[PDB]
Ligand binder design. Structure first.
Ligand SMILES: CC[C@H](C)[C@@H](NCc1c(COP(=O)(O)O)cnc(C)c1O)C(=O)O
Ligand SMILES: CC[C@H](C)[C@H](NCc1c(COP(=O)(O)O)cnc(C)c1O)C(=O)O
Lengths: 365, 360
């Protein structure tokens, strides 16, 4: 018993003022450059309306829209890569569709068919193929969004909603192969999410309270925030990335560990891919288990820690070299291990994402 | 002064297509009906633009507006009451202005001068005075809102923002409510943002409120900790009038520990009760164990919620997991509830002169 919204029904309108691309690899600050078209689907009493694809344009919302009063909003983030030159592929889009639908049900927003949305996104990206860069480490960021849109102040299940997708060409997250480490502020006073909360869904509500904390991290000399949880001070996620630790655990076994999906952390697509990939190799233990600051401190001085990094769509595998804890700067030996594992993960993903290696994880055009 | 828009700069555009005021039938559903005008002020690199009272109209937002991607949004809720004379008064608006500014700083949104916003709100209400109902227990609900509005996908401090205010005539709200108290749902946490009126606090409650209904309750009593403590109920702070374990008669309400929204009505009930001096008034943690045990022992007199929508709201039942708990509120006259309600109406409708009220 559930909705619809079909891809066979798209309508099409092309831009009369096709904006001009970034040119050489120089500008494009992430998220501030948009392509010529966008996807838009409306839902109401008559259910889902028809998809289509229109020129990039402003939204028109009633002043009481629940999307602005009660944060009835959720989003996704995924990437399209252009490799064999002009051939464009989406990395594991199905997982983002699965996650988006779960976020929708948590916020009582309308359900939709994951494959139809994926096909409309495919159609949209097709129209803006030329916006997809092909220089090393660049890609096209895809931002689907679903918002409640009830022109009513009652806190309740909306009877109207809007789904849209916009695209941004992105530069190489790292200047040029320059994989550079980041420093993290790890302060227990800051709490991103709670057990029983909504940290495991991609809801706008989870992000707004982090702006002030990120500003604090900069003022204290760090680049991102390492979110801690519990009296235990466990490591949950870093910034907008899941966190991984490669070290010789306390029982002498070499392992790659990452916090488990206990409800407080976001099930990252890159996170799942690194786990899958490492399990496949079978060269060392790969496990999902709780990581505490106390365990990290001990391992660091017995020189048991090899590499620590974050994973996410923006920055696939991100080295960490320093963590400021309790006034405490902890040097993380990641780079002196020449991010061997980090480097290996990056290479495999590049080969897969840019079509060098055929793989089911990729979705065509 | 630099850092704020000014009431003296107000530009105003009267409507050329009035709405029909709520007809005779009189069915006033909350937040469903809007008056003719709204307030709008923009902020950016050049800072605050000039305030504007304009016809009620849609907002035009860039698809990447941070208000829609990262919930850079907050709001307020307060009421204007029209008394016998026909004079309109705002109830303790300064507290809402203070709370709105605290919410803005928490979300790195632009600061503004509280008195200037209050004056523009005063001017907006004046324009739409004809919308302020005057039948018993009716009022005009005021909804200021401040949202981030940078056309960028980066999660960061916006360089653009929009502040607007819309008004709704409200038709009323006695009768007790039932509450669902289930530990599985967590609304806010220590170190979180439950003490700010941010839209992000509300969206996740929709599903839970739907669950409360399918379970036969009308609202949600939010619990927190192993420590099943009572935080707030629905969109109201929660109060308990009883004889405590120490056998002393008191009025208790959970403390402002970051744990909950500092309600304006809540602060007013505390002030008023403290003033009377007839019984102990305190801010302390309240646990389900203590409640269960106080009920068991007939020490509980009245339990109620407080909030702008429903000033003092009697509670008669709480479903705690399987456990339907009857709350003796109505059989104890809501004696304290009635006295609070009596006093607030006299103050809010101008029967009794008071500093809590702000003119027109
Ligand atoms: C502005 C967009 C969001 C910051 C963002 N999400 C990535 C994310 C991740 C990584 O998830 P994936 O990109 O799906 O692998 C993990 N944890 C949190 C709290 C996150 O926010 C992104 O799309 O990059
Ligand atoms: C639907 C009503 C609005 C959300 C609103 N605040 C009510 C409220 C309150 C009570 O605050 P007051 O209205 O200021 O007394 C307490 N806790 C929560 C979680 C609330 O939402 C208001 O001031 O109208």
């Amino acid at each position: 018993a559930s909705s619809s919204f079909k891809a066979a029904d798209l309508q099409l309108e092309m831009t009369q003022k096709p904006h001009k691309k970034p040119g050489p690899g120089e500008p494009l600050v992430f998220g501030k450059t948009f392509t010529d078209h966008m996807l838009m689907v409306e839902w109401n009493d008559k259910g889902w309306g028809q998809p289509r694809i229109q020129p990039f344009q402003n939204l028109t919302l009633h002043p009481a829209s629940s999307s602005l009063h009660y944060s009835l909003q959720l989003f996704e983030g995924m990437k399209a890569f252009k490799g064999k030159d002009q051939q464009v592929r989406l990395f594991r889009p199905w997982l983002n569709m699965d996650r988006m639908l779960r976020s929708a049900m948590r916020l009582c927003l309308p359900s939709f068919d994951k494959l139809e949305l994926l096909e409309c996104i495919r159609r949209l990206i097709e129209v803006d193929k030329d916006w997809v860069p092909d220089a090393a480490g660049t890609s096209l960021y895809v931002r689907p969004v679903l918002i409640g849109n009830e022109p009513s102040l009652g806190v309740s299940q909306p009877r109207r909603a809007l789904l849209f997708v916009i695209l941004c060409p992105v530069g190489a997250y790292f200047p040029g192969g320059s994989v550079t480490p980041v420093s993290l502020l790890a302060d227990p006073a800051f709490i991103r999410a709670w057990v029983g909360g909504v940290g495991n869904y991609k809801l706008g509500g989870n992000y707004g309270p982090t702006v002030l904390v990120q500003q604090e991290a900069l003022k204290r000399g760090c680049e991102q925030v390492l979110w801690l949880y519990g009296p235990d001070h466990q490591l949950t996620e870093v910034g907008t990335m899941n966190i991984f630790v490669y070290w010789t655990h306390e029982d002498g076994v070499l392992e790659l560990v990452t916090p488990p999906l206990n409800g407080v952390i976001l099930p990252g697509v890159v996170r799942q891919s690194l786990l899958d990939m490492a399990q496949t190799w079978g060269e060392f233990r790969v496990v999902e288990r709780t990581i505490t600051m106390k365990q990290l401190l001990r391992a660091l001085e017995e020189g048991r820690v090899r590499e620590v990094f974050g994973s996410g769509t923006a920055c696939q595998v991100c080295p960490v070299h320093r963590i400021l804890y309790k006034d405490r700067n902890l040097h993380i030996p990641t780079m002196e291990n020449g991010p061997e594992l980090i480097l290996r993960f990056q290479k495999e993903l590049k080969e897969i994402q840019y079509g060098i290696r055929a793989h089911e994880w990729m979705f065509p055009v």
